[PDB]
Paper text:
α-Methylacyl-CoA racemase (AMACR; P504S) enzyme plays a vital role in branched-chain fatty acid metabolism by catalyzing the conversion of 2-methyl-branched fatty acyl-CoAs into a near 1 to 1 mixture of the (2R)- and (2S)-epimers, enabling further metabolism. α-Methylacyl-CoA racemase from Mycobacterium tuberculosis (MCR) has been explored as a model to understand the AMACR racemization mechanism and as a drug target. The catalytically active enzyme is a homodimer (with an apparent molecular weight of 83.6 or 89 kDa) with the active site at the interface between the two subunits with catalytic bases contributed by both subunits. Each MCR homodimer contains two active sites formed by residues from the large domain of one subunit and the small domain of the other. Key catalytic residues from the large domain include Asp156 (helix 6) and His126 (helix 5), while Glu241 (beginning of helix 9) is contributed by the small domain.
The ibuprofenoyl-CoA 1 side group is a phenyl ring (C33, C34, C5, C6, C7, C8) with terminal carbons (C4, C3, C2, C1) at the C5 position. Here, the density completely covered the Cα-ring and extended to some of the terminal carbons in most active sites. The terminal carbons showed variability in their orientation. Clear electron density for the thioester carbonyl and Cα-Me groups in the ibuprofenoyl-CoA 1 and S-2-methyldecanoyl-CoA 6 complexes shows a cis conformation. The thioester oxygen forms hydrogen bonds with Asp127, Asp156, and His126. Ibuprofenoyl-CoA 1 and analogs and 2-methyldecanoyl-CoA 6 were relatively potent inhibitors, with ibuprofenoyl-CoA 1 displaying the highest levels of potency (pIC50 = 5.05 ± 0.05; mean ± SEM, n = 3). This level of potency is ∼20-fold less than the corresponding values for human AMACR, where ibuprofenoyl-CoA 1 and analogs had an IC50 value of 200 to 500 nM (pIC50 = 6.7–6.30, respectively). As expected, all these acyl-CoAs were reversible inhibitors and caused competitive inhibition with a Ki value of 3.04 ± 0.34 μM (mean ± SEM, n = 3). In contrast, ibuprofenoyl-CoA 1 is the most potent inhibitor of MCR, and greater variation in inhibition is observed between the other compounds. Our results are consistent with a different mechanism in which the side-chain is held in a relatively static position with the different stereochemical configurations accommodated by a subtle clockwise or anticlockwise rotation of the α-carbon.
Numbering used by the authors:
A (entry chain A): 1 to 42, 45 to 359
B (entry chain B): 1 to 40, 46 to 359
Amino acid sequence: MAGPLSGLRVVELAGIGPGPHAAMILGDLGADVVRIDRPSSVISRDAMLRNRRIVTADLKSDQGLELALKLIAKADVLIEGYRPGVTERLGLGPEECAKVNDRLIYARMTGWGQTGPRSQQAGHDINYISLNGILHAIGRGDERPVPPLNLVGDFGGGSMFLLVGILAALWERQSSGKGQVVDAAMVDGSSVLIQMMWAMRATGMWTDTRGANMLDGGAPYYDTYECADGRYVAVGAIEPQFYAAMLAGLGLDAAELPPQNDRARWPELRALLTEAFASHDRDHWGAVFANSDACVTPVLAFGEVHNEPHIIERNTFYEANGGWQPMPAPRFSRTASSQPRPPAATIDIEAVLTDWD
Amino acid sequence: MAGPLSGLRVVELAGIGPGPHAAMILGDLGADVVRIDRPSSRDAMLRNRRIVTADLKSDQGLELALKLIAKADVLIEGYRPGVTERLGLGPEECAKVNDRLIYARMTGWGQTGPRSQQAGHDINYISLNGILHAIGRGDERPVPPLNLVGDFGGGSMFLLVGILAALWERQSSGKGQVVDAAMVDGSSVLIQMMWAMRATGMWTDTRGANMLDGGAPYYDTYECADGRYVAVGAIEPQFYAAMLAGLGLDAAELPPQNDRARWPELRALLTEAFASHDRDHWGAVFANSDACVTPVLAFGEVHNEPHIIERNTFYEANGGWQPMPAPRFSRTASSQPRPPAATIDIEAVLTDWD
Ligand SMILES: CC(C)Cc1ccc([C@H](C)C(=O)SCCNC(=O)CCNC(=O)[C@H](O)C(C)(C)COP(=O)(O)OP(=O)(O)OC[C@H]2O[C@@H]([n+]3c[nH]c4c(N)ncnc43)[C@H](O)[C@@H]2OP(=O)(O)O)cc1
Ligand SMILES: CC(C)Cc1ccc([C@H](C)C(=O)SCCNC(=O)CCNC(=O)[C@H](O)C(C)(C)COP(=O)(O)OP(=O)(O)OC[C@H]2O[C@@H]([n+]3c[nH]c4c(N)ncnc43)[C@H](O)[C@@H]2OP(=O)(O)O)cc1
């Protein structure tokens, strides 16, 4: 099996969102990933279940439990993302796992954490980011907050911190010879994800007013603009030298505009930039500014990404069943990753305990 | 030093956004982190570091740097491609003085290809791979999700997964290697769920018309009587039904939860209901509930929130609050971040390491 995480053995108790996204990446990088789903369901639809062996097993039954408990015994990592108490009351808790394998990295993916008042509440991405200030900061100032899909709570502030915890604990287990419990809460990870704003907030460089900051769309030089065809460009020309390059491509003379960072005159500035970008279509701007430091790029829809040169040449995507999918990231010089394998039709848990000798 | 990464040694060449964030998290978890800046701190992102100066273009500045890297486990650089090569700090020069080094390259566009030398920021990397187009209301231009998705989630976090996966690989092979983390790639994997969903006909390229983009009335924010907001995330029918009951809404009178043609009508009924009381009222009503209804707090209110206070998600420092390390560890727990450690001379650090 190809990739830097070759050898690594992972047990994933089937859940939704972060838990599986973490498991995918471990797989992606060559870990051996075994997912136990409920029998009361089931070759899979979700391309998120790539780089995976799937096994049936009713964990409520006494048999199901011990089979599971065997897999965990011969494995490096356990991933679960159920509310607190669920694995305990199944007989798969940390304390129970530590008795068949004190090397186990016990990885617990939740929104709210393992304790505290909200620890039993149901929730999704949007709820976790609502409590820690993030959601309030996203969207235009004249309107209600808009959810950044489930990118910030589930994945960026959830799965990815689960991965860092798993892999940091594996580094630890090289010294001490023992595993441990990784407690990944989306509300905490997403908070560290936005540490920049907490830092800027302290030094007067970020306010709580939505749509009135450097990076939220309030700056006319860091925002999207509608073009003549109703498609969009993005502008991220923060540094003055890049902003100057953008102005020249737009045909605007700096002498006729207000200063880039005079906020009181951002309305005028925005109006000027808006009229300029509105006068040609996205693909015009795309050409004018390619190879340029103007920080102006076309805003592509998913369906167009496969035609973008830089995306094609670096193989950011591969084809798989009437749909493109992202190739693993990041990339490794010596132990490169493979193309992911599609979800691996169900298997029997004995066959896996056997294969794992 | 407290944390699961005690005695990991990390050299960081100073830049902006992702590279510093990754270095921060490494520090947060107990790693020894030395950051080389240029002779020309306030940012709390520079927490859990030692800062040193060094003209990397001088003969001596370079010599010193290579003496650090020789002793360290990980090097982090976030410059445009070619930049570290020309300084004399490229992968191959580093592999001469330390074949074990994990060499971590943090860019937006990647190491090669047509845009590889183009300046950019977060908003640009996510414009090219479909992400930015997908965010915001439908009647309107896309809105940047701050720089959470390219710099951090699709950026620093993938650098970290790569640094630590390469540390694992090393333990079996004795050898370092190069980690190429590009924000346009990481952010693409970060949104793999949408790519899966699109392949099976359960996501469209229309903005504001999906389960998770704000187009679903059960997955969106709502304005309340006081002008503040709640978030609703009641995807599962049982959670949704719990929410209707607490709103005072008889299910029989409403359109089906998932009849999309009638979402606008559904949304107008839920809008009226949420508008009729203040945000704090809904926070009370739905506490301990599975209704998936939560107050949308502004940054300055977060320190007053029970679940935040009691789990110590933040700590106080300097101006105000900062996030404590994540994730958390049972045995080898992280400590409260140290503020940034004012300029020390780089020779000191070298005697301190062997
Ligand atoms: C493809 C797309 C559409 C899917 C999708 C993706 C993403 C999302 C959004 C955006 C997200 O944010 S996903 C994140 C949700 N939050 C979390 O994951 C945080 C922690 N988890 C939770 O809070 C819960 O799992 C939650 C999702 C909220 C609610 O789930 P629930 O109450 O139905 O389940 P629960 O976790 O409390 O308990 C599970 C239940 O199942 C049982 N179980 C598990 N496995 C098996 C098995 N193999 N055989 C038999 N029984 C089994 C457990 O024992 C337990 O039973 P119990 O006795 O307690 O009732 C939504 C949907
Ligand atoms: C707090 C706020 C204000 C900060 C802030 C945070 C975040 C953001 C947004 C949201 C972001 O997206 S940050 C991410 C930006 N993109 C990237 O980092 C991707 C990779 N990097 C780049 O593309 C570029 O570094 C770029 C950010 C575009 C800026 O380009 P640049 O030309 O200024 O720099 P470059 O990388 O081309 O070369 C740097 C230059 O510095 C020199 N350097 C470094 N270290 C030293 C040293 N110790 N002593 C002497 N010289 C030194 C290098 O030698 C090099 O010089 P060169 O001779 O080649 O011109 C914006 C601002």
